[PDB]
C-alpha cells in the first residue's frame, strides 16, 4: 500500500471530507494569485467551474527569517517558470487575476488538514505544467485514488470553462488579452470550440 | 544608495572578505550537486576555473516540518526548470556531478556570513538561466558593485573552462555525454572553440 493521496476534482469536495483529519490530496488548477507578506504566503488557484478565481487557497506557513527566505525563493522560481516577472530582491508580492494575463497550469500536492469543521491546505509539491505540454496532453492523450486520467480530465475541463468565460461578455477573461496568444493557442481554442458538435 | 550587493567572480574572493560580517553577494556558476536530508539541504555550484565541482556551497537551513517542506518544494522547482527528474514525493535527494549530464547555469544571490575566520553562504534568490538564453547572451550581447558585464563575463568564462575540460582526457566531462546535446550546442561549441585565433 501507499499514502493513498486523494485526487480532488473540486474544492466543493472538501465539504464532505473528515472534520478532524490529515488527508493528502492532489488537484489540478490554474494559478490565480500570489500574496507574499512577512507573516503570510498564500497561493490562489482556480479551476473555474461555474467563473470564480481562488477556489483553492494553499498556505506556505513560516515563522523564521530562514522560512521567510525559503517561501520567497519558492515564489520566485514559480513566477520564473511561468514567465511572471517580479520586483528585484534588493528593491511584499501581490499578484491577482494572474489568468487574465498568463494561464499557469499547475498540478499540486497538498495536505488537507481540518479541525472543528475548518480546514487548511498546506503545499507539499507543485508541478508547473507548460502550456505547450497541456495542449499536447489534450490534443494527444501513485495511489489507487488517482486515476491516470484525472489530471487529463481536469486539464480538459479547465480549458472548457475557460472557453465559456471567453464567450461571456461580463467576464474580463479573454484569450486575446493573454500576453502569450500564439497561433497555436488560437487554433487549439478553435479546435476545442469545435468539439461541441 | 542600496544594499551594494557584491558580485563575486570566484570562491577564491571569499578569502579576503571581512572575518565577522554579513555581506550580500551574487555569483554565476553551474549547479553541480543537490543534497536533501532531514536536517540539511545543500546546493553545490561550480565555476570550473582551474576542474573542481562544488566550489560554492549554499545552505538552505531549516528546523521545522514547514521549513523542511519549503526546502523540498524549492529543490523540486529547480530540478523541474532544468529537467532534472526526481523520485516521487510519495515514494533524501542526492545529486552529484550534475554537469556531466546537464549544464545548469544559475545566477545566485547569497549572504556571505562569517565568524572567527569561518563563513557560510545562505541563499536569497536563484535565477536558473536557460541554455538557450546563455548561448544567445554569449553569441549576442542593481548596485554599484555589479557591472552589467559581470554576469556575461562569467557565462563566457564558465563555457571556456568547460571547453578545456572537454579536451582533457582525464576529465569525465564531455559535451557529447550531455543528455541534451543539440546541434546548436555543437556549433556554438565549435564557434567558441574557434575564438582562440
DSSP A130: P
Q: In whole angstroms, what is the distance from residue B53 CA to residue B99 CA?
A: 9
Residue labelled with grid coordinates 469543521: A117
**Residues with Cβ within 8 Å of residue A151, at least 6 apart in sequence:** A7, A28, A107
Q: Are B81 and B8 in contact (CB under 8 A)?
A: no
- What's the gap in Å between the CA of A81 and the closest CA on chain B? 7
Chain A closest-CA separation from residue B34 CA (Å): 16
Contacts of residue B73 in chain A, CB cutoff 8 Å?
A: 60, 74, 123-126
Handedness of CA B172, B178, B181, B185 (dihedral sign): negative
Question: Containing H/E element for A173?
Answer: none
Which among A3, A73, A78 has the least Cβ separation from residue B125? A73
Please answer yes or no on whether A126 and B73 come within 8 Å at the CB atom.
yes
Fold that domain A140-197 belongs to in CATH: Arc Repressor Mutant, subunit A (1.10.10)
Which of A67, A70, A78, A80 should one mutate to test binding to chain B, selecting the residue with the greatest count of B CBs within 10 A? A70
Query: Domain-by-domain residue ranges, chain B?
Result: 1-139, 140-197
Q: What's the full length of chain A, in residues?
A: 197
Residue with cell 470553462: A161
User: Within an 8 Å CB–CB cutoff, is residue A7 touching chain B?
Assistant: no
| Cβ atoms B166, A117 nearer than 8 A | no
Q: Å from A71 to nearest chain B CA?
A: 6
Nearest to A166 by CA among A123, A92, A124, A103: A103
Residues in chain B, overall count: 197
Are B76 and B86 in contact, with CB atoms under 8 Å apart? Answer: yes
CA angle at A24 for the pair A19 and A27, rounded to the nearest 5°: 105
- In whole angstroms, give the CA distance from residue A158 to residue A10: 11
Find, among B90, B191, B94, B63, the residue nearest to B135 by Cα: B191
Touching check for A40 and chain B: CB below 8 Å?
no
d(CA A133, CA A105): 10
In CATH, the number for domain A1-139 is 2.40.50.800
Distance CA B5, CA A90 (A): 8
Distances (CA, A) of A155 to A81, A137, A168: 18, 8, 20
Task: Taking the CA atoms of A149, A154, A160 and A163 in sequence, report the sign of the dihedral they define.
Answer: negative
Amino acid at each position: 500500500s501507499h499514502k493513498n493521496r486523494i485526487f480532488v476534482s473540486s474544492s466543493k469536495d472538501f465539504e464532505g471530507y473528515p472534520s478532524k483529519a490529515i488527508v493528502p490530496v492532489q488537484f489540478v488548477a490554474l494559478l490565480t494569485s500570489i500574496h507574499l507578506t512577512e507573516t503570510k504566503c498564500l497561493l490562489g488557484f482556480s479551476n473555474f467551474e461555474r467563473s470564480q478565481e481562488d477556489q483553492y487557497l494553499i498556505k506556505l506557513k513560516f515563522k523564521d527569517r530562514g522560512s521567510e527566505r525559503l517561501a520567497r525563493i519558492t515564489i520566485s522560481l514559480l513566477c520564473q517558470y511561468f514567465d511572471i516577472e517580479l520586483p528585484d530582491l534588493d528593491s511584499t508580492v501581490i499578484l491577482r487575476d494572474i489568468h487574465l494575463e498568463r494561464l499557469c497550469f499547475s498540478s499540486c500536492k497538498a495536505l488537507y488538514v481540518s479541525k472543528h469543521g475548518n480546514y487548511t491546505l498546506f503545499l507539499e509539491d507543485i508541478k508547473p505544467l507548460d502550456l505547450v505540454s497541456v495542449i499536447s496532453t489534450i490534443s494527444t492523450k501513485s495511489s489507487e485514488l488517482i486515476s491516470e486520467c484525472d489530471l487529463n480530465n481536469s486539464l480538459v475541463d479547465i480549458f472548457n470553462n475557460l472557453i465559456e468565460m471567453n464567450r461571456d461578455e461580463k467576464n474580463r477573461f479573454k484569450f486575446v488579452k493573454l500576453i502569450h496568444y500564439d497561433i497555436e493557442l488560437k487554433k487549439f481554442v478553435q479546435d476545442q470550440q469545435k468539439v461541441l458538435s
